[PDB]
Design a protein around this ligand. Structure first.
Ligand SMILES: [Zn+2]
Ligand SMILES: [Zn+2]
Ligand SMILES: [Zn+2]
Ligand SMILES: [Zn+2]
Ligand SMILES: [Zn+2]
Ligand SMILES: [Zn+2]
Ligand SMILES: [Zn+2]
Lengths: 456, 453
């Protein structure tokens, strides 16, 4: 093992006084010194091999292998043959004795000729190992940068999740403390108006008391003069007898009901940017009259003219789609429905045969929903039969809708109060998209389906 | 026909030079120039009775008798006769001429004798006016203190309303970014260990290349030495052939909802480490663990006593303490309990007599029997129920605020978050007591141990 366990990959010197580390390794001194990079100034001097460090300040000087050691230094006979059964080089005397008296072999000259011939193949394996190690280096850089930049995206989402409600709270507190401060200004004006009034009154009253104290002993003429003057002024200020009442504030004060309604108002007012970039009539229909930037809809008393047959347009399906749709991000918009007693909403891809709303259900991804007669829901869902819902204790007025993607986050909830929305139903599952959601209003229907339909 | 401008009715002093201004009033200047309170030292422009735009240099004056005279002295006849149709006292010439040739009057003496008699009565009226002025000053101070203390309460509610979610967001971001930093540390440990490995590999590869470059032209002995050494080490490293992914739960797209869910939990109102009260305790509800955890067994119970603070038949529990301001939150578990009851009552109803005691007298009820048959009653014939959700119910949450009667108790099928399924709506003067009851064993299975906090 002079060349098997006593083979330093760095030195192959005359091994004596090996340095032992807490990793469980024995090695040489300058051989290990040849490794550069990490001095104790930058930190640990860990073993690059076995995940167990050892500082140069924890010397456990153990020379066990150096004392286990004992041309050739044993026979003056140079190393002679590499064993072909043991796969080991020894010297002729040291080989025949001990190790290699009983194996199969190949002669030394032939073996070294084989090696001197095969040299470039091992060099190619060397540069191939270098190529693989650099492939792994590139994987390392790509993985580390992808991780830290995904962290960049996550911390940015954190930043925006902060910013939404942070700016909301700042704006609400500022608005309402300025409201309170303007009430302060009004009350201050009132109190200083009464201040000026009553301050003039009492100041001149005490002036009057001192003046009468002086005038109590004047001759009869000016005596009566001042008497008449004071009589007139006192009768005037008693005619100006103001019957005063208190103020009776009705300022909305911080109770402990606010939390619910204010928290709904923020739950609504969480809203990213504008979606006032309108629709596409690419499959529009006859029976409707539109206005208000082409947005408010109804029907009128003019029979509707038919349309020539076209491939994309429906046979009769009187519905509407829009223009924009993405496959990333978030979007919001707001509508109202008025007194409309029957309508329908759903969504469809490029796959269905648009001409004909015959038997066609979300079984093929032809997603449906509708309602008749005020509140009578008809939920055609992944079952050929509709379902119903609540009859709420108040009529529904507006609608508001929002889209997020990764979960197929579809959102459409009533907004009968612009301060606060009220949920109706959702389906927490994913849709690939973007295909279009489509929305339908029925015909004139004798004028019964002819009452206005709002939007902004 | 007011003669009020004999002098200024608000100054009663020397030369005035009356101002005819756009306020609709006749003004002086020294009246409030010598005296502060409505001063020009800060830019005041208001009338103490109208508050109209007016400046002190719009003079349109009269100096008739001021230039004439230097006692009436318009005739060298002092004021002589008081007039009664107009309540004026003038001199014979100035009265009879013009003003007072045709009125009711008092010539000489009775009126001024009345005045000399009534002097102290008008002084007493002056004391009354002083008392009224002090009433108005006290109203001023009361308004000042109410205003500044309303500012106190509003700014304090603002501070705490900030602090709750401000500390919540800070804590959540800190916890999760430190979690991210620890994931960074893990990735750093992996990359630096592989760094040490591969840098040692390439460094000793460079050593091998330089050694072979130097030594490729040496004698055969050390040649064969190197041959065997490299053979052994290279077959060792080919045996050491490495045969080579974070699953971090990322934010969802509905993620905003769950973040709001956890905030809805950790809103952090006051803590209620104050459990039930055995002020009317009974046998079959054994309590332990600082009066928290309760059980019961198959040994019959001593019969009922009779006193003030004890129930009719209900072997049940009442509460110790309750105030009239603030908020109180808690989270509960029910185990496999299929039947129980909770409610609230005032100091008026009797705890004796198990007849149909109902919220008809404001004795508000809620209960459950037989697995999931909910029974929540108000003044009617039968208690009501609701949809029975599918995912198994585990835990409960409850909340109280006082001034608005904010009563709350909602499902918490995951203790992280509650979901509103059933509660009532009333404001109570209070504080009236919450009471709690568990029914019998029914072979043991109707009575299983109970917990809170
Ligand atoms: Zn060495
Ligand atoms: Zn030998
Ligand atoms: Zn051998
Ligand atoms: Zn004056
Ligand atoms: Zn005025
Ligand atoms: Zn006269
Ligand atoms: Zn008269």
């Amino acid at each position: 093992l002079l060349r098997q366990e006593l083979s330093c990959p760095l030195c192959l010197q005359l091994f004596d006084a090996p340095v032992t580390a807490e990793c469980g390794h024995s090695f040489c001194r300058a051989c290990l010194i040849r490794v550069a990079g990490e001095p104790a100034a930058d930190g640990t001097v860990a073993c690059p091999s076995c995940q167990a460090p050892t500082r140069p300040q924890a010397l456990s000087t153990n020379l066990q292998l150096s004392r286990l050691v004992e041309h050739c230094e044993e026979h003056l006979d140079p190393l002679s043959i590499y064993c072909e059964q043991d796969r080991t080089l020894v010297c002729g005397v040291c080989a025949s004795l001990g190790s290699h008296r009983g194996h199969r072999l190949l002669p030394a000259a032939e073996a070294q000729a084989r090696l001197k011939t095969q040299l470039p193949q091992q060099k190619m394996q060397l540069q191939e190992a270098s190529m693989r190690k650099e492939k792994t280096v590139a994987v390392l850089e790509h993985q580390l940068v992808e991780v830290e930049e995904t962290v960049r995206q996550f911390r940015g989402a954190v930043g925006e999740q902060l910013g939404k409600m942070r700016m909301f709270l700042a704006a609400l507190e500022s608005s309402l403390d300025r409201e309170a401060e303007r009430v302060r200004g009004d009350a201050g004006v009132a109190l200083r108006r009464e201040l000026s009034s009553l301050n003039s009154y009492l100041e001149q009253l005490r002036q009057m008391e001192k003046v009468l104290e002086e005038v109590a002993d004047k001759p009869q003429t000016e005596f009566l003069m001042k008497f008449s003057l004071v009589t007139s002024r006192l009768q005037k200020i008693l005619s100006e007898s103001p019957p005063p009442a208190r103020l009776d504030i009705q300022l909305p004060v911080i109770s402990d009901d606010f939390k619910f309604q204010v928290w709904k108002h923020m739950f609504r007012h969480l809203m990213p940017a504008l979606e006032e970039l309108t629709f596409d009539p690419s499959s529009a229909h006859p029976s409707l009259v539109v206005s208000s930037s082409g947005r408010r809809v109804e029907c009128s008393d003019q029979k509707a003219p038919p349309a020539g047959e076209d491939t994309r347009q429906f046979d009769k399906a009187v519905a509407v789609v829009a223009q924009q749709l993405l496959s990333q991000g978030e979007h919001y918009w707001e509508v109202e429905v008025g007194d409309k007693p029957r309508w329908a909403l759903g969504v469809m891809a490029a796959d269905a045969s648009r001409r004909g709303r015959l038997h066609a259900v979300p079984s093929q991804g032809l997603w449906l929903l509708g309602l008749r007669d005020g509140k009578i829901l008809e939920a055609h869902v992944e079952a050929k039969e509709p379902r119903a819902l609540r009859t709420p204790e108040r009529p529904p007025a507006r609608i508001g809708l929002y889209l997020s993607f990764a979960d197929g986050v579809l959102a459409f909830y009533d907004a009968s109060n612009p301060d606060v929305l009220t949920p109706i139903f959702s389906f927490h599952e994913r849709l690939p998209g973007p295909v279009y959601p489509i929305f339908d209003v029925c015909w004139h229907d004798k004028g019964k389906n002819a009452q206005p339909l709002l939007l902004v």
